[model samples]
Target: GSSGSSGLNRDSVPDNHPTKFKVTNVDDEGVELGSGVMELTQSELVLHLHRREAVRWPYLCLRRYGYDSNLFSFESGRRCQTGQGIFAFKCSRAEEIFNLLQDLMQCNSINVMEEPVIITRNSHPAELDLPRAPQPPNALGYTVSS
Candidate 1:
């Protein structure tokens, strides 16, 4: 009756709070719907909900009578790969990134029966762990000559 895997739970995620998933072969410009690179980064994924109402009530006339009322959300991720360069911009706000996914879905280009792509690389950099520090231009030692 349910489309998702038995162990995975979509409802556990909060609305508006971005969810993470992995994808593959995303484009550099982020325009190629289903073609481009071979891998994706973890942070690049976001929650995209489409056709929510129909999915909720499958027993309704429109959904039950073979009207094709499909509702679902997918976790979107960026295309990152080994030996390939990383995305130029931050993965979180990549509009071009999201746009690519939109095109794929709109055209029905994706393989619905297949599982979403997953990137195995450790995309989370350690630099984020460092504390922020105030900048002082003079700290680099370009001292004024007395």
Candidate 2:
């Protein structure tokens, strides 16, 4: 009927301008779940996993484990545990986004960017540090210093 997630084909992502993907689904245990379409725009990618699935369910995210990880699982900047989404991402041109994809996808490349660059995080994480976590006098986003 309609396209988007419902009509997504399990194909290698287009290296054109970038848009969406339909990769094999994988479970939380790194097992293949079946299929799903990981959809989002270039800018939106920096926000949420923007995931979708068949059957009746809210347009939810990939759902990260750990109450901590799941905090922003749908909020943005991706914090979910991925499997299939990973395989779908290799089709995009955002090299720097691999680690982020690795979080939700198990992965594509489109030269969608004006000037593509090969990012290097082969041995590191994509997320920034925990924002210095309250240091000493500050606790939980407050100044507790006497």
Candidate 3:
């Protein structure tokens, strides 16, 4: 069987440059969870914790991602009650990273830029329908607004 680029190792990834970005993982409560080095690859986003094992989220597995100020935040799953909550990172050159990630997802046939869903809620008590992931395997893009 002829193999192309099926199971290439981390070091063998051709296009991605492993640039180190100083980052801090902030929780939903705006508390700093930890600080570390973040690495962006073509396959996944790696977070090397300064005092713990590293964590990685594949580009395809990112449920929602966005960049604002110096924070690059992402969530792998979504829920109203919050399970494996958001991973918000404070980093430098955020716009560049955001654009690069968008590019990578696009190259992999993942549409990072999708149409926004306007959410509305009235004063009545009812379950607010949250925006969800699409049917296919691509992630949903998040944009910050005022």
TM-score, every prediction: 0.18, 0.25, 0.54
TM-score of 3: 0.54
lDDT of 3 by residue, 1-146 (tens): 11245565565322224354667777766677787666765556777755655677777657677898877887775432233667687765676678778766767844345535634424666775555676757789999999
lDDT of each: 0.29, 0.36, 0.65
- Candidate 3: Cα lDDT at 139: 84
RMSD of 2: 16.4
Across 69-100, the per-residue lDDT of candidate 1 in tens digits comes to: 11122321222122223322223323433534
| Residue 66, model 3: Cα distance from true site in angstroms | 1.1
TM-score of 2: 0.25
Top model number, lDDT: 3
Show model 1 residue runs off by greater than 4 Å.
1-17, 21-26, 35-81, 88-146
Candidate 1, residue 91: Cα displacement in angstroms equals 8.3
List RMSD in Å for every model shown. 18.0, 16.4, 15.5
State model 2's lDDT: 0.36
Clash totals, every prediction: 5, 22, 0
Candidate 3 stretches with Cα past 4 Å from truth are 1-18, 29-31, 78-83, 109-146
